[PDB]
Enzyme design. Structure first.
Site, PDB file in Angstrom:
ATOM      1  N   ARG A  78      -8.326 -43.370  30.133  1.00 28.07           N
ATOM      2  CA  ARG A  78      -9.571 -43.071  30.823  1.00 28.07           C
ATOM      3  C   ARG A  78     -10.042 -41.627  30.893  1.00 28.07           C
ATOM      4  O   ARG A  78      -9.362 -40.694  30.452  1.00 28.07           O
ATOM      5  CB  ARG A  78      -9.467 -43.588  32.255  1.00 28.07           C
ATOM      6  N   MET A 127     -16.284 -40.812  48.431  1.00 27.99           N
ATOM      7  CA  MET A 127     -16.601 -40.110  47.199  1.00 27.99           C
ATOM      8  C   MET A 127     -15.346 -39.464  46.642  1.00 27.99           C
ATOM      9  O   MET A 127     -14.583 -38.861  47.390  1.00 27.99           O
ATOM     10  CB  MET A 127     -17.630 -38.997  47.438  1.00 27.99           C
ATOM     11  N   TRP A 150     -16.056 -45.953  36.216  1.00 30.64           N
ATOM     12  CA  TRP A 150     -15.218 -44.832  36.581  1.00 30.64           C
ATOM     13  C   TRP A 150     -15.633 -43.522  35.924  1.00 30.64           C
ATOM     14  O   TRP A 150     -16.656 -43.455  35.249  1.00 30.64           O
ATOM     15  CB  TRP A 150     -13.746 -45.186  36.332  1.00 30.64           C
ATOM     16  N   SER A 151     -14.844 -42.481  36.142  1.00 32.63           N
ATOM     17  CA  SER A 151     -15.156 -41.144  35.655  1.00 32.63           C
ATOM     18  C   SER A 151     -15.555 -40.922  34.204  1.00 32.63           C
ATOM     19  O   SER A 151     -15.146 -41.654  33.302  1.00 32.63           O
ATOM     20  CB  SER A 151     -14.018 -40.205  36.034  1.00 32.63           C
ATOM     21  N   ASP A 186     -13.860 -38.303  42.377  1.00 34.58           N
ATOM     22  CA  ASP A 186     -14.193 -37.525  41.172  1.00 34.58           C
ATOM     23  C   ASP A 186     -15.622 -37.074  40.880  1.00 34.58           C
ATOM     24  O   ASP A 186     -16.571 -37.853  40.984  1.00 34.58           O
ATOM     25  CB  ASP A 186     -13.764 -38.281  39.915  1.00 34.58           C
TER      26      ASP A 186
END
Ligand SMILES: *[C@H]1O[C@H](CO)[C@@H](O[C@@H]2O[C@H](CO)[C@@H](O[C@H]3O[C@H](CO)[C@@H](O)[C@H](O)[C@@H]3O)[C@H](O)[C@H]2NC(C)=O)[C@H](O)[C@H]1NC(C)=O
Ligand SMILES: *[C@@H]1O[C@H](CO)[C@@H](O[C@@H]2O[C@H](CO)[C@@H](O)[C@H](O)[C@H]2NC(C)=O)[C@H](O)[C@H]1NC(C)=O
Length: 537
Positions: free
Chosen positions: A145, A19, A81-82, A21
């Site tokens: 991003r 795990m 992703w984040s 962000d």
């Protein structure tokens, strides 16, 4: 032999695996939602990363759910992703996140819950037109991003920032939209910095002056200052300033551009990254989440079966002086406190070590306040350009000074063969001005090999003449969160002592300085486990 001695008792972490962000934190319909970068297949980063999901009513006890966001379209086929959550008028939570598309480029996608009747928002639907935003003209496909939570300007226009860089120059790319679906890049970045590399997980929000409360992201005004936060060069940095929606201008209070030097502020000076905050309108506070990486080896991670922790959520606000942020674990943590052990008016003579008995030393909440005597005896050391971390690594608990080192010995073995020392040192310049150094000396935290035992340190902005030096420590097995001077200076440490496999941890208070220091008051509480229920499959 104790099983999984490094797993925490009250910090958030998935049942297993990797795990990193924290993603889309938010409060919706009375439920706190937490998402996070997760690898369903290993205890290391991988080609397939998805959004893990958990819910809570108090930010302490959690229910693990099935992942919320995972590759289902071309716009995010290689990974999810984040990203961040924004609750739009009409009471609909919208999630903006960076997807890795089929061409392996970073693009921004939109998703929202498909069943608002579900208190846990398990199912999410993705916008048919994803990706909504693709890399700007001169930006590489892998340098764009982590969209932030959006804010609605007085003109009814939404703003968000996306991190990246243009020719190695960190950028907080600003985008605008009225329908939250069609976004247009603003001509200039909201903020930027030369040669910092890609700005990761940018966060931009307001904080109220002379208040310990939090504000909805869309608040603006003269009694409000804004925080521009970005991760780069391995750490999370932030700067306080003034924001003008009109001209999309962010002016740093100190007039500096981030450089990632001892010149800039950080939320935490230890292992702390990809931090993201959200507004909690139920308690009127801003809560901060942060990924705390492992400092053991990858082989160790694969062996124990998991990697990565989240810091304990902390309330966040601006200091009275308006020059820095203050952090403090959310009050809900106090419910975990069991028995208490207290000390008052206790002198710590030079070179002494005082053990604190009766506390669950591996899972505790410890606060201590030091009253100093003979400040004039402080070692003369101008600290104008000194690197506090370098200084702590050079002078650990074994390096004896006049005022310091004095503090706490956490996750320590009975014989002190292994210990993590969180302490202070007091210096003065030639003009008699005092400075305070806070250190997390991890040099002897473990006898194990292949463990990053680098120490951390930072200067605390307090006046030793008029205020006692206070320290609060959240001890939870392989993580220790230290808060100096009420949250003015935070340092998160990851430690892996070998003794925890067979024997219990101990807790001590110590003073290795040559000057005497007094514990005006100390409070220690054993902390019971937070509850983690699984409601998956
Ligand atoms: C702070 O007070 C002491 C200040 O040095 C420190 O002493 C430790 O024990 C002796 C000094 O009494 C020294 O140990 C030396 O010898 C051992 C032999 O096994 C070496 O392994 C050590 O590296 C070192 O050369 C050191 O001065 C120090 N030893 C260490 C680093 O553990 C106390 O340990 C300090 N007290 C606390 C609570 O940290
Ligand atoms: C949308 O969410 C609601 C609320 O969770 C779901 O309704 C529950 O469904 C479970 C399983 O079928 C039942 O045991 C509960 O009694 C239902 N409670 C309510 C509030 O009706 C509903 O199934 C979800 N819809 C979809 C498409 O999955």
């Amino acid at each position: 032999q104790i099983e999984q001695p490094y797993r925490t008792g009250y910090h958030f972490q998935p049942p297993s695996n990797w795990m990193n962000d924290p993603n889309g934190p938010m409060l919706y319909q009375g439920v706190y939602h937490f998402f996070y970068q997760y690898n369903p297949y290993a205890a290391t980063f991988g080609d397939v990363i998805i959004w893990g999901h958990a819910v809570s009513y108090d930010l302490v006890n959690w229910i693990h759910l099935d992942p919320a966001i995972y590759p289902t379209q071309e716009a995010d086929s290689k990974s999810c992703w984040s990203g961040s959550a924004t609750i739009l008028p009409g009471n609909i939570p919208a999630m903006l996140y960076t997807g890795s598309d089929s061409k392996s480029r970073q693009v921004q996608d939109l998703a929202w819950p498909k069943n608002l009747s579900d208190p846990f928002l398990r199912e999410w639907v993705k916008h048919p037109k994803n990706p909504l935003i693709t890399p700007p003209e001169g930006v590489k496909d892998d340098c764009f991003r982590d969209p932030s939570t959006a804010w609605l300007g007085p003109d009814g226009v939404w703003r968000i920032v996306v991190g990246g860089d243009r020719d190695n120059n960190g950028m907080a790319f600003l985008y605008q939209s009225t329908d939250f679906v069609n976004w247009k890049r603003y001509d200039q970045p909201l903020s930027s910095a030369d040669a910092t590399g890609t700005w990761e997980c940018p966060d931009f929000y307001p904080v109220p002056l002379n208040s310990t409360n939090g504000l909805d992201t869309s608040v603006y005004g003269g009694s409000v200052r804004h925080v521009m936060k970005a991760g780069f060069e391995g750490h999370d940095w932030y700067t306080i300033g003034t924001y003008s929606p009109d001209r999309e201008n962010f002016l740093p209070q100190n007039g500096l551009s981030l450089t990632g030097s001892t010149l800039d502020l950080r939320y935490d000076y230890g292992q702390f990254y990809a931090s993201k905050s959200f507004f909690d309108d139920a308690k009127n506070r801003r809560v901060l989440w942060a990924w705390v990486p492992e400092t053991d080896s990858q082989a160790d991670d694969i062996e124990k079966g998991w990697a990565g922790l989240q810091s304990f959520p902390r309330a966040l606000w601006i200091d009275r002086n308006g020059k820095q942020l203050i952090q403090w674990p959310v009050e809900e943590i106090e419910e975990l406190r069991q028995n208490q052990v207290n000390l008052q008016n206790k002198n710590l003579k030079p070179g002494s070590v005082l053990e604190i008995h009766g506390i669950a030393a591996s899972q505790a909440d410890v606060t201590i306040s030091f009253k100093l005597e003979g400040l004039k005896e402080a070692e003369v050391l101008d600290t104008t350009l000194v690197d506090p971390q370098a200084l702590c690594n050079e002078r650990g608990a074994s390096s004896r000074g006049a005022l310091g080192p004095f503090g706490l010995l956490a996750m320590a073995s009975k014989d002190l063969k292994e210990q993590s020392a969180i302490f202070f040192r007091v210096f003065q310049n030639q003009l008699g001005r005092y400075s305070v150094l806070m250190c997390s000396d991890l040099s002897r935290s473990t006898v194990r090999s292949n463990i990053d035992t680098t120490s951390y340190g930072a200067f605390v902005d307090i006046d030793p003449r008029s205020e006692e030096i206070s320290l609060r420590n959240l001890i939870d097995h392989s993580i220790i969160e230290s808060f100096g001077a009420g949250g003015k200076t935070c340092i998160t440490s990851r430690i892996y002592p070998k003794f925890v496999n067979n024997e219990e941890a101990h807790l001590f208070v110590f003073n290795n300085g040559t000057q005497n220091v007094k514990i005006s008051e100390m409070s220690a509480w054993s902390m019971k486990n937070a509850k983690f229920v699984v409601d998956q499959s």
